[PDB]
């Protein structure tokens, strides 16, 4: 059983994005960070839902002695794609990539085609000053850029009565070439017979004040507040009183209008289409069409065509073309003769009555 | 009209805003241009009315704040922008930069240089602390604290009385040491 309460993260989850030394510098980085003052899903423990894992995850928890063993990573968590496990035992870690099947609870039942076992000093350090009130809060940040799993951690000593507001950096612990994709992320539990904070990272532009000895004192964003923006763009932590110029304010156009002339200039298409005495095929009437706007809707609405094939142009693409001249040859003809009329055809009509040239740029219309 | 729109008037393509017009296009005239060859007015090809063109929304955002040692309160400025536009055009834009802001704190104080979205206007004569432009100066003052905007004051008002037979002569004297740095 678990709950999904929401809490504020304050300023929390800033690490060393690099490995380099800086003293009294105000270096600015653009890396994956947990946004300041972003809500984080606070869980509870008394089954172990599978949380996403996208561009990393911030993990933090507080427990009295031990309730958390490790985390399971990978995709589909089964014997079809490679997996990962960070189970932390008494005094060692069991980092390995494998193809674990399923446990639902002595945690995996398959080790097929898998390697890269790793063992080092334990991740979870527990120290008590002869009292249980000292409940250390352990934070972790995982991410999977170009493989190369990275884990950062620091166990703050601040009681654990509430989520601290003070600043605590994150020192890297391990960096290993895992080499497999990770999308889902679970957690394991313990057995001896107010924790489980989770946040998600997104790319952001921070500003970190490196101390003299390389520690991090304080950091600000430039995606949170106007003050934070000016403080980031005027790189410094103290902004003197005055006016400052940060960026430019634009507005894109909302709607696009086009306006072409009032022209109607209706072609004599109606006259031919609403004609009665259509001349025969042996005397095909050729009507010259010029100095007019060739609207094809008047053609569409006047005849329920049975053959509207086109050769040199697209039947849909006729509104957006301008033609030097248009010729309309109209004749009443039989049924099969309609399909007989086409470029590169033959017959008693295509050879003796009306022949369509091979290089024809136009369309034919046939309606009963 | 009166909105940042995209236009494709009779073959002329660009971005701008339009309204009614009051000059005297000749009947054969169709188009608009200027000394440095920029298209201004396009006759409506379906109304024979004149409409004109303006660059979409150009502006520059500036942040006026007291020292961070004093307060985190800030007031934002948008140079030379009518501030119905900033407010209605907040939606459907980028949000991290190109500031979003929800105009709450006695906003749209439209000045002669822009508008302070986050500052309250007032009629007083304090000295200038943070010059703004067009004779406006903002200042952090206790209300219980907020950023106010007010017109410049050129100094404490004074008036000697020039009288045909009035002379004032100092009876005591002081010594002062200033400082000049070059």
């Amino acid at each position: 059983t678990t709950t999904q309460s929401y809490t504020n993260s304050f300023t929390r989850g800033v690490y060393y994005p690099d490995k380099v030394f800086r003293s009294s510098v105000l270096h600015l980085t653009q890396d994956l960070f947990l946004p300041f003052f972003s809500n984080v899903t606070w869980f509870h423990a008394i089954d172990n839902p599978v949380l996403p894992f996208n561009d990393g995850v911030y993990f933090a928890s507080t427990e009295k002695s031990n309730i958390i063993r490790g985390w399971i990573f990978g995709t589909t968590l089964d014997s079809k794609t490679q997996s990962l496990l960070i189970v932390n035992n008494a005094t060692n870690v069991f980092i390995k990539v494998c193809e674990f099947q399923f446990c639902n609870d002595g945690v995996y039942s398959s080790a097929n085609n898998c390697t890269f076992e790793y063992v080092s000093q334990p991740f979870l350090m527990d120290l008590e000053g002869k009292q249980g009130n000292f409940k250390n809060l352990r934070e972790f940040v995982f991410k999977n850029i170009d493989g190369y799993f990275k884990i950062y951690s620091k166990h703050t000593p601040i009681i654990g009565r509430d989520f601290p507001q003070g600043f605590s950096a994150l020192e890297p612990l391990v960096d290993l070439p895992i080499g497999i994709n990770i999308t889902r992320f679970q957690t394991l539990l313990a057995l001896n017979r107010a924790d489980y904070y989770v946040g998600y990272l997104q790319p952001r532009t921070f500003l970190l004040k490196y101390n003299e000895n390389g520690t991090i004192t304080d950091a600000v964003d430039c995606a949170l507040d106007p003050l934070s923006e000016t403080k980031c763009t005027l790189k410094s932590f103290t902004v003197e009183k005055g006016i400052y110029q940060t960026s430019n304010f634009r507005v894109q156009p909302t709607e696009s209008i086009v306006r072409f002339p009032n022209v109607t200039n209706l072609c004599p298409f109606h006259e031919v289409f609403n004609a009665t005495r259509f001349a025969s095929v042996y005397a095909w009437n050729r009507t010259r069409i010029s100095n007019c706007v060739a609207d094809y809707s008047v053609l569409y609405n006047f005849a329920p065509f049975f053959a509207f094939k086109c050769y040199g142009v697209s039947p849909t693409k006729l509104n957006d073309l301008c033609f030097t001249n248009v010729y309309a040859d109209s004749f009443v003809i039989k049924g099969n003769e309609v399909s007989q009329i086409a470029p590169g055809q033959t017959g008693n009509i295509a050879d003796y009555n009306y022949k369509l040239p091979d290089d024809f740029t136009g369309c034919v219309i046939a309606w009963n | 009209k009166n909105k940042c729109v995209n236009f494709n008037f009779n073959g002329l393509t660009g971005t701008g805003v339009l309204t009614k017009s009051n000059k005297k296009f000749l009947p054969f005239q169709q188009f608009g241009r200027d000394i440095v060859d920029t298209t201004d007015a396009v006759r409506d090809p379906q109304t024979l009315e004149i409409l004109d063109i303006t660059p979409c929304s150009f502006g520059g955002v500036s942040v006026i704040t007291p020292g961070t040692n004093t307060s985190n309160q800030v007031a934002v400025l948008y140079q030379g922008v009518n501030c119905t536009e900033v407010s209605v055009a907040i939606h459907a834009d980028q949000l991290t930069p190109t500031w979003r802001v929800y105009s709450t704190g006695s906003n749209v104080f439209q000045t002669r240089a822009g508008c302070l979205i986050g500052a309250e206007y007032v009629n007083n004569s304090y000295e200038c602390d943070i010059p703004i432009g067009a004779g406006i100066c903002a200042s952090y003052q206790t209300q219980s604290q907020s950023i106010i905007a007010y017109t410049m004051s050129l100094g404490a008002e004074n008036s000697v009385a020039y009288s045909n037979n009035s002379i004032a002569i100092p009876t005591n004297f002081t010594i002062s040491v200033t400082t000049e740095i070059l």
Partner: antibody, heavy 126, light 111 residues
Amino acid sequence: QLQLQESGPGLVKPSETLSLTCTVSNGSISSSTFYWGWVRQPPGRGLEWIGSIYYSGSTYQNPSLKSRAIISVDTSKNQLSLKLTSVTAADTAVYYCARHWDVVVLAAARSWFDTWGQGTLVTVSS
Amino acid sequence: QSVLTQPPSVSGAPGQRVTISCTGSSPNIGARNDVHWYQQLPGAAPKLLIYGNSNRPSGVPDRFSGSKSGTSASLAITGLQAEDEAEYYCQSYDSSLSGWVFGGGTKLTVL
């Protein structure tokens, strides 16, 4: 091609459990590569994601409707099951079974819904 | 629960350009998250048009072009036809809610 057939009582009295179920044809719900989910859309409003569920039993789920929506899956009969409790007048909507959130390569932020059901118009009345 | 903002309605002449925009808050959907676009004919299931902010599935016309910059995302329609009138939806993933979200739905009307 992948088809979804979901059914349920289109009329339910206020305040008890509401239950629908989707069917997958020309495919298998045991397919590990993709997820499966339920999307509801009240009339005159926008789409709303009510939860997604994997074949094993892991469940995506919207925190706003945490205490009322239970989603279950079975691989034997290829059936996607959705339950909703404490239904009130605000839950009148049309429900869809959806397939999305590829696990092998895409991440949880680039996931897009791909397969949609025909929809069942479900209302609550007294 | 509408973290993505959409214009209630829009209209235009057939065969013209219309732009549909979708943006979200800052601590919510971020730069990495991508925005997909769904079309819903009345009384029908929503249909996908663009995913990955620049890619379309098989059968989707090349006329529908979209783009995402920073947080704001938008579509561009060329050669508007009478069949394009529908309910359009923008959707992406909200990292603060750990779950997907949908836009309010914009009304595209052909004039």
